Amino acid sequence: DIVWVEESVSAITLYAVWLPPRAREYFHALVYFVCRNAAGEGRARFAEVSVTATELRDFYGSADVSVQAVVAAARAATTPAASPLEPLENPTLWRALYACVLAALERQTGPVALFAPLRIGSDPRTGLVVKVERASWGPPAAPRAALLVAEANIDIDPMALAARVAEHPDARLAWARLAAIRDTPQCASAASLTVNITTGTALFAREYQTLAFPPIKKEGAFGDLVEVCEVGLRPRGHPQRVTARVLLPRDYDYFVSAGEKFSAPALVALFRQWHTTVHAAPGALAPVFAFLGPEFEVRGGPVPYFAVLGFPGWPTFTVPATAESARDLVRGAAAAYAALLGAWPAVGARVVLPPRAWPGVASAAAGCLLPAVREAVARWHPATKIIQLLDPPAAVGPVWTARFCFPGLRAQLLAALADLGGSGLADPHGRTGLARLDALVVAAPSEPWAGAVLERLVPDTCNACPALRQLLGGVMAAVCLQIEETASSVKFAVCGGDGGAFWGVFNVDPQDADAASGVIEDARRAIETAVGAVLRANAVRLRHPLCLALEGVYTHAVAWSQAGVWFWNSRDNTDHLGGFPLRGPAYTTAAGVVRDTLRRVLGLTTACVPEEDALTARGLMEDACDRLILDAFNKRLDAEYWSVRVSPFEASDPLPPTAFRGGALLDAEHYWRRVVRVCPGGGESVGVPVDLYPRPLVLPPVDCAHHLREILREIELVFTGVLAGVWGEGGKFVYPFDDKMSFLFA
Numbered sequence: 001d002i003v004w005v006e007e008s009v010s011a012i013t014l015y016a017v018w019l020p021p022r023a024r025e026y027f028h029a030l031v032y033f034v035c036r037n038a039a040g041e042g043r044a045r046f047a048e049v050s051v052t053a054t055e056l057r058d059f060y061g062s063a064d065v066s067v068q069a070v071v072a073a074a075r076a077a078t079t080p081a082a083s084p085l086e087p088l089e090n091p092t093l094w095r096a097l098y099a100c101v102l103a104a105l106e107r108q109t110g111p112v113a114l115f116a117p118l119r120i121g122s123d124p125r126t127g128l129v130v131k132v133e134r135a136s137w138g139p140p141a142a143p144r145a146a147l148l149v150a151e152a153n154i155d156i157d158p159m160a161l162a163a164r165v166a167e168h169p170d171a172r173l174a175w176a177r178l179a180a181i182r183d184t185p186q187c188a189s190a191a192s193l194t195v196n197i198t199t200g201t202a203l204f205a206r207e208y209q210t211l212a213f214p215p216i217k218k219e220g221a222f223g224d225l226v227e228v229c230e231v232g233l234r235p236r237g238h239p240q241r242v243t244a245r246v247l248l249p250r251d252y253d254y255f256v257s258a259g260e261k262f263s264a265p266a267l268v269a270l271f272r273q274w275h276t277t278v279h280a281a282p283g284a285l286a287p288v289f290a291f292l293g294p295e296f297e298v299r300g301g302p303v304p305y306f307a308v309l310g311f312p313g314w315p316t317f318t319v320p321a322t323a324e325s326a327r328d329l330v331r332g333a334a335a336a337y338a339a340l341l342g343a344w345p346a347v348g349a350r351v352v353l354p355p356r357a358w359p360g361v362a363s364a365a366a367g368c369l370l371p372a373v374r375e376a377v378a379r380w381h382p383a384t385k386i387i388q389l390l391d392p393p394a395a396v397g398p399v400w401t402a403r404f405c406f407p408g409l410r411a412q413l414l415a416a417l418a419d420l421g422g423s424g425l426a427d428p429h430g431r432t433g434l435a436r437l438d439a440l441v442v443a444a445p446s447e448p449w450a451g452a453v454l455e456r457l458v459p460d461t462c463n464a465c466p467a468l469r470q471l472l473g474g475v476m477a478a479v480c481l482q483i484e485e486t487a488s489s490v491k492f493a494v495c496g497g498d499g500g501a502f503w504g505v506f507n508v509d510p511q512d513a514d515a516a517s518g519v520i521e522d523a524r525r526a527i528e529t530a531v532g533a534v535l536r537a538n539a540v541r542l543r544h545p546l547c548l549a550l551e552g553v554y555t556h557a558v559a560w561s562q563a564g565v566w567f568w569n570s571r572d573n574t575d576h577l578g579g580f581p582l583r584g585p586a587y588t589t590a591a592g593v594v595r596d597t598l599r600r601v602l603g604l605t606t607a608c609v610p611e612e613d614a615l616t617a618r619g620l621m622e623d624a625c626d627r628l629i630l631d632a633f634n635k636r637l638d639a640e641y642w643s644v645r646v647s648p649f650e651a652s653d654p655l656p657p658t659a660f661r662g663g664a665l666l667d668a669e670h671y672w673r674r675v676v677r678v679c680p681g682g683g684e685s686v687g688v689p690v691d692l693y694p695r696p697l698v699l700p701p702v703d704c705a706h707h708l709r710e711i712l713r714e715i716e717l718v719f720t721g722v723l724a725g726v727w728g729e730g731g732k733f734v735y736p737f738d739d740k741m742s743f744l745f746a
Helices: 052-058 068-079 091-107 158-167 175-183 184-189 264-278 326-339 358-365 371-378 409-422 433-444 447-465 466-489 516-535 585-601 608-634 704-726
Strands: 002-020 026-036 042-052 117-122 129-134 146-151 196-198 204-207 217-219 226-234 240-249 256-260 315-319 395-396 399-406 492-497 501-506 550-552 556-558 563-568 575-576 644-646 675-679 686-690
Touching: 002 042, 002 068, 002 091, 002 240, 026 068, 042 052, 042 091, 042 129, 042 226, 042 240, 052 068, 091 129, 091 608, 146 264, 158 175, 184 264, 184 447, 184 556, 196 240, 204 399, 240 264, 240 686, 256 326, 315 326, 326 399, 326 433, 358 466, 358 675, 371 466, 395 704, 399 516, 409 433, 409 447, 409 466, 409 575, 433 447, 447 466, 447 516, 466 492, 466 501, 466 516, 516 550, 550 563, 550 575, 556 704, 563 585, 575 585, 585 608, 585 704, 675 704
Parallel strands: 146 256, 256 315
Antiparallel strands: 002 026, 002 117, 026 042, 117 129, 146 196, 196 204, 204 217, 226 240, 395 556, 399 501, 399 550, 492 501, 556 563, 563 575, 644 675, 675 686
């Protein structure tokens, strides 16, 4: 006799993480379900889980973490006024915590799925969800949203940022700010924070000079869009009746924040104020104040996100810029939330499998393969490329060339190998995380939102399990071997590539095009079929049937380095350049100059002795360099144009002591540091972090005698490669920048 309802779960958040009595190595966690029934009406629900120590150490990847540490972190996060920003101590701890609580939720209660129909039960005697089951009836309500804008001037003292950056050098400045709030929470009490959440029913706007103080401007009402719910619960951990206050999000479902100037400290401060305001009255339990994002780690992260691990229980999606297709990225964020249960991108690679169950699956996948690939996996050394390719100083043409790619080969191969090791998993029900990856791979061609997930879930998974790299690159090595074997039969000739993407030539007469399409299509058919056959023979089965993409037909192709290739189809003048670093806005203009110079220099096929062509080519390359440096002068004062994106891994210029004064601008720095080298006074070249100063900027003249030298070094690799690849070798194209056209800037 269990109650039964019909609802869709819109979010799953963490309320309490406690250690029951007579307990040493298992902690209970209460989960808040934001359920909404048909037509949008929302009733709040709760469930309980029980995570053991072993599961925690599995999702952490190490035994350093303990149940006592997790419970202490949760207790610290119980109060945001005393100490917010709890995850910043051990971000991996909270990452693993959310991973295991979601896994236990899936295991004990049953299958859960956001924004999807779900039959839900409850036990009144205790008062929590007991079992969740996938339903098959109902046109579920649309996942409504609310647009949030929040800006705060948290008066952080610059010297503290400088000191904390001195302790850890390559600390992304958002982490420096966030650590400053963490070490002095009173700073989050005084800030000119402004908030404007617009919904479809009623708007809400507030303005503060000091956060704790009453608003200096009120628009709409808090109750208009927010419903406070007091729910009684009797967990197995708590025998006494425990009451919980939750902020049921009426009217909306999730938040949509612009990622252009998103400040994680701003939302942290606003949510801390809301937490204090709602849980000020006692007689009820307090929730977990936990948030994760790329700003929460020293070295930062690629993809902007803002996790909501606890209070208020509403997912908030940062959609960076992309104004033209704002709806597209909002839908992509919503789909990423719904599919991977909202763990992505906060939990990390643990959405699929625990970081420590992978060492078993990889071993269990090295056994079900064929005997040859079994060794091929074991002999994989970084960048082996055991396949007949071209010497990197070389070029081809005029012959019919073609580029091919298998869309999402690493992700599809990882999915097949995960299934091969699936039998080796401890729990058959613990393979639901192995159902999200297949959902991603299946929906990858249909929708690009799965794409960006798979281009980051896979490389990060390969870092979670180092042993998976030698497996994936062995399977791909086997794929390349059969590509080469089948190539000879269809006149295709492997000339270069990087595995899933490969470009080659055809031994057809280089003048006929009517039959060219036929051979170019038969080669695709045969290579695709043969690779699929090898994969099937290797037992690895792909969910989405394999497909080869004809990414372009070209007549000339020139390669200089291992990644640098330029292709050009003379008939339609369609070209493609790869391997040129786009490390700024000037490198794009350099790439365009290179792709025009190469188009003009391979148009010199007029009958001539090879020696003549080398000189009439070098002259044109020098002229192209001249026209580039001439146009460089007309943009000498655009410092943002002469900017380079330094990674937190690369060696970086030292931060000026005045860049620590950007206010609500230091938060934007999550991954890249955009630096411009200016030349104050004389002789000395100093770096300016462009995005840490207010605009319009005032600077000494930009040292174009440094950036143009680097751009010219890249253009020179491309041109030494083409000069020594089409005609006779022996010529390193050098442009005398220091003499011919140095005067313009220095």
